[PDB]
């Protein structure tokens, strides 16, 4: 039983702030309140403490990450680039 | 205030060096909500704490009163 | 019960009785 057709989590804002701004906020709020897999213990138990800080309820591991997601595309690209450079340096 | 239950410990407390005074108190109580009976509390006044020994036997209480040391100052009732 | 299928204790008891009867019937028919 869906209670709202489109506003979803942004139903708490009522008719305020504008529809496009409410959509923009909705996307990032869903991202920031989602639950993510832990790369250490393999469980889906990682939640945001504060902006950029992501803690796993099990195994008590805290990782730095993005403001509203655990990993950003820029960070993933940087990781791949650093891996390639390290492999080139070793080889 | 402390409660003691060992009779030998009570006698040692009465013979302790700093102990000068004791009090004997008589209460009228009911055992298992039955007939009235007599309860005796012996209270030894120490320097730091007051020690209480409770005896529900009148004959044993009378025997203990007789066995109290003579230099100890006893306040009855 | 968490999903609000039973109005009260008597309804739950009647449903339990019916479910046990249906399980016994199915087991006897498959035997």
């Amino acid at each position: 039983a869906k209670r709202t057709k489109k506003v979803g989590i942004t139903g708490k804002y009522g008719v305020r702030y504008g529809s496009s701004l409410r959509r923009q906020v909705k996307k990032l709020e869903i991202q920031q309140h989602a639950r993510y897999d832990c790369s250490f213990c393999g469980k889906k138990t990682v939640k945001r403490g504060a902006a950029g800080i992501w803690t796993c309820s099990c195994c008590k591991k805290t990782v730095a990450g993005g403001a509203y997601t655990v990993s950003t595309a820029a960070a993933a690209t940087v990781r791949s680039t650093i891996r390639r450079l390290r492999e080139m340096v070793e080889a | 205030a402390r409660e003691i239950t060992d009779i030998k410990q009570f006698l040692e407390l009465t013979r302790r060096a700093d102990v000068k005074t004791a009090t004997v108190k008589i209460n009228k109580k009911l055992n298992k909500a039955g007939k009235p009976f007599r309860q005796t509390k012996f209270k030894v006044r120490g320097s730091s704490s007051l020690y209480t020994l409770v005896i529900n036997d009148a004959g044993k209480a009378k025997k203990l009163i007789q066995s109290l040391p003579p230099t100890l100052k006893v306040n009855r009732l | 019960s968490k999903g609000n299928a039973f109005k009260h204790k008597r309804a739950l008891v009647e449903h339990i009785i019916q479910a046990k009867a249906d399980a016994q019937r199915e087991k006897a028919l498959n035997e």
């Binding site: 990032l28 403490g49 730095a64 990993s71 450079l85 | - | -």
Partner: protein, 213 residues
């Protein structure tokens, strides 16, 4: 004419930074013998939020090389750094995210952050969330390194200047609308007294040159 707010802010007074809840200044280690010649290993003990700063910070504990004790440093957390991770700082440190290396020891295209402008000033460039510095190239004869800054500028700095491998965590913060004067209020309460802002046109000519009409 009356003194405007732009001129008033220089005297300090009510325009100073609100620093009660800060964790401490975020700096690299002091450039010492160990970092100049080899490397030194510390451990990430916790990752914490700093009031008034978008990016999280990381507490890194090293051993004192000259005395039996522990030294705690406050680094700016790069993305991917976790609690319990080992961090290596020095000229001989490996090329891994979170390590502190001189700019001359990394290849072209390396992405770094908290980069020293001069060797030993303990971090000056690319400190805000999501920002980084790109290693464009090297000039070994002058012992220099060409880098690209977040603003797009190209700079030449010493190859002995240090930088932390990776990108500052907490990126994408400014993509969320605040929606509310209240959220802006709570944002600047932890930073300084610069909000709300009154337009100069709405003022009198005595208050601001833009006033009148």
């Amino acid at each position: 004419g009356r003194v405007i707010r732009n001129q008033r802010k220089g005297a300090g007074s009510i325009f100073t930074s609100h620093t009660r809840l800060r964790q401490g200044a975020a700096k690299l280690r002091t450039l010492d013998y160990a970092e100049r010649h080899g490397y030194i290993r510390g451990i990430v003990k916790q990752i914490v939020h700093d009031s008034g700063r978008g990016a999280p910070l990381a507490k890194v504990v090293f051993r004192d090389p000259y005395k039996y004790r522990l030294r705690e440093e406050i680094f700016i957390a790069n993305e991917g750094v976790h609690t319990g991770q080992f961090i290596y700082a020095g000229k001989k440190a490996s090329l891994n995210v979170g390590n502190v290396l001189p700019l001359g020891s990394v290849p072209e295209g390396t992405i770094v952050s908290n980069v020293e402008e001069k060797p030993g000033d303990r971090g000056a460039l690319a400190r805000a969330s999501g920002n980084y510095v790109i290693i464009i190239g090297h000039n070994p004869d002058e012992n220099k390194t060409r880098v690209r800054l977040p603003s797009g500028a190209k700079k030449v700095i010493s190859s002995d200047a240090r930088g932390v491998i990776g990108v500052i965590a907490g990126g994408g913060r400014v993509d969320k609308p605040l929606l509310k004067a209240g959220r802006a209020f709570h944002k600047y309460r932890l930073k300084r007294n610069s909000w709300p802002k009154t337009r100069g046109v709405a003022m009198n000519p005595v208050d601001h040159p833009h006033g009148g009409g």
